[PDB]
Design an enzyme around this catalytic site. Structure first.
Site, mmCIF file in Angstrom:
data_model
loop_
_atom_site.group_PDB
_atom_site.id
_atom_site.type_symbol
_atom_site.label_atom_id
_atom_site.label_comp_id
_atom_site.label_asym_id
_atom_site.label_seq_id
_atom_site.Cartn_x
_atom_site.Cartn_y
_atom_site.Cartn_z
ATOM 1 N N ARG A 74 2.644 10.133 -4.331
ATOM 2 C CA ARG A 74 3.225 9.284 -3.454
ATOM 3 C C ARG A 74 3.597 10.216 -2.280
ATOM 4 O O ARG A 74 3.453 10.009 -1.128
ATOM 5 C CB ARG A 74 4.384 8.555 -4.056
ATOM 6 C CG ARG A 74 4.129 7.540 -5.002
ATOM 7 C CD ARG A 74 5.529 7.555 -5.420
ATOM 8 N NE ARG A 74 5.387 6.281 -6.430
ATOM 9 C CZ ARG A 74 6.153 6.009 -7.441
ATOM 10 N NH1 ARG A 74 7.240 6.745 -7.800
ATOM 11 N NH2 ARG A 74 5.996 5.093 -8.363
ATOM 12 N N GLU A 125 5.157 10.765 -8.161
ATOM 13 C CA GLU A 125 5.621 11.271 -6.968
ATOM 14 C C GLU A 125 4.806 12.130 -6.167
ATOM 15 O O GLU A 125 4.891 12.254 -4.958
ATOM 16 C CB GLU A 125 6.990 12.163 -7.368
ATOM 17 C CG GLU A 125 8.217 11.466 -8.486
ATOM 18 C CD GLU A 125 8.385 10.137 -7.882
ATOM 19 O OE1 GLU A 125 8.155 9.578 -6.643
ATOM 20 O OE2 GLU A 125 9.232 9.458 -8.305
ATOM 21 N N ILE A 132 4.285 4.368 -14.135
ATOM 22 C CA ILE A 132 3.761 4.706 -15.531
ATOM 23 C C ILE A 132 4.246 3.605 -16.743
ATOM 24 O O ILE A 132 5.253 3.477 -16.646
ATOM 25 C CB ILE A 132 4.047 6.096 -16.025
ATOM 26 C CG1 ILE A 132 3.500 7.277 -15.203
ATOM 27 C CG2 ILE A 132 3.771 6.258 -17.574
ATOM 28 C CD1 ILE A 132 2.057 7.418 -15.169
HETATM 29 O O1 LIG Z 1 14.681 5.524 -10.721
HETATM 30 C C1 LIG Z 1 13.719 4.315 -11.438
HETATM 31 C C2 LIG Z 1 12.579 4.573 -10.886
HETATM 32 O O2 LIG Z 1 11.794 5.696 -11.698
HETATM 33 C C3 LIG Z 1 10.462 5.470 -11.508
HETATM 34 O O3 LIG Z 1 9.774 5.677 -13.147
HETATM 35 C C4 LIG Z 1 9.541 6.470 -10.738
HETATM 36 O O4 LIG Z 1 9.596 6.185 -9.396
HETATM 37 C C5 LIG Z 1 10.190 3.990 -11.449
HETATM 38 O O5 LIG Z 1 9.512 3.365 -12.323
HETATM 39 C C6 LIG Z 1 11.725 3.402 -11.342
HETATM 40 O O6 LIG Z 1 11.776 2.448 -10.359
#
Ligand SMILES: OC[C@H]1O[C@](O)(CO)[C@@H](O)[C@@H]1O
Ligand SMILES: *[C@@H]1O[C@H](CO)[C@@H](O[C@@H]2O[C@H](CO)[C@@H](O)[C@H](O)[C@H]2NC(C)=O)[C@H](O)[C@H]1NC(C)=O
Length: 246
Positions: A163, A160, A71
């Protein structure tokens, strides 16, 4: 763009929004039958706009980098907010350009920086559709500390879950009652980059991982994932971060 309205939301429509979200991310190859996100996309094509509506009808449009599902920021009425990170600032040059004002948040989008700003780790933050409705609301009105929290809820509700099928399920179970994410949920989030890299190195290694991935399972037990046959790879993960970006 993709959309989700909480007014009238249930596991069914949340399912569709998260299905649409996955359908909007571009790929040209599948690895072990799992969409492989692009290495990069030039220009505005790189950002997907999610339209989210809280229960009362207010809205925010969230921008997501389609190659990693990170994001980048969002527009709330006539103000735009972007994390304090280079990618976000670059993103600011293509989206919400007609916002009357632009606020750079005080912290980049990493889970670590966000938890410090929020004063608690994610392990202690309830998520679920209700929590996602509080988040939409919190962000309509700038507050850096409350936004840190609303953002950990938003990322998990939407990125998430796109994903991981398992995370999407956790949220459907939480459709009318929030609950802190199970520790396996936190593990997956933490291992996405790694699983993504390992699903790809296995391509020319007979489906075996060069390096195993340590995970926590449904029961809370620590398991090791060493090849593509695992349920994590056959059913669970739904998108892969291109190694060109790892
Ligand atoms: O923990 C760091 C991670 O958290 C996120 O916002 C979600 O996966 C990514 O943008 C970043 O790499
Ligand atoms: C690939 O991973 C599978 C598990 O997903 C491994 O096979 C299993 O491993 C042991 C038996 O040797 C058990 O704990 C599992 O229950 C087995 N599962 C099944 C369905 O057979 C396999 O050995 C791994 N292969 C490599 C190369 O590491």
């Amino acid at each position: 763009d993709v959309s989700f309205r909480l007014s009238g939301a249930d596991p069914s429509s949340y399912g569709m929004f998260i299905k649409d979200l996955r359908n909007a991310l571009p790929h040209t190859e599948k690895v072990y039958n799992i969409p492989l996100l692009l290495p990069s996309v030039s220009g505005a094509g790189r950002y997907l706009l999610m339209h989210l509506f809280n229960y009362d009808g207010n809205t925010i449009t969230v921008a997501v980098d389609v190659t990693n599902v990170y994001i980048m920021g969002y527009l709330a009425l006539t103000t735009s907010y972007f994390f304090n990170e280079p990618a976000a600032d670059l993103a600011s040059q293509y989206v919400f350009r007609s916002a009357r004002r632009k606020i750079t948040l005080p912290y980049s989008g990493n889970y670590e920086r966000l938890q410090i700003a929020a004063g608690k780790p994610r392990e202690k933050i309830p998520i679920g559709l209700p929590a996602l409705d509080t988040a939409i609301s919190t962000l309509l009105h700038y507050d850096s500390t409350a936004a840190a929290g609303a953002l950990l809820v938003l990322i998990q509700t939407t990125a998430e879950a796109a994903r991981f099928k398992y995370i999407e399920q956790q949220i459907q179970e939480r459709a009318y009652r929030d609950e802190v994410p199970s520790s396996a949920t936190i593990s997956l989030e933490n291992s996405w980059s790694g699983l993504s890299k390992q699903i790809q190195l296995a391509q020319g290694n007979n489906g075996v991982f060069r390096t195993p991935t340590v995970l926590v399972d449904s029961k809370g037990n620590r398991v090791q994932i060493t090849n593509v046959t695992s349920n994590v790879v056959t059913s669970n993960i739904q998108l892969l971060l291109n190694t060109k970006n790892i």
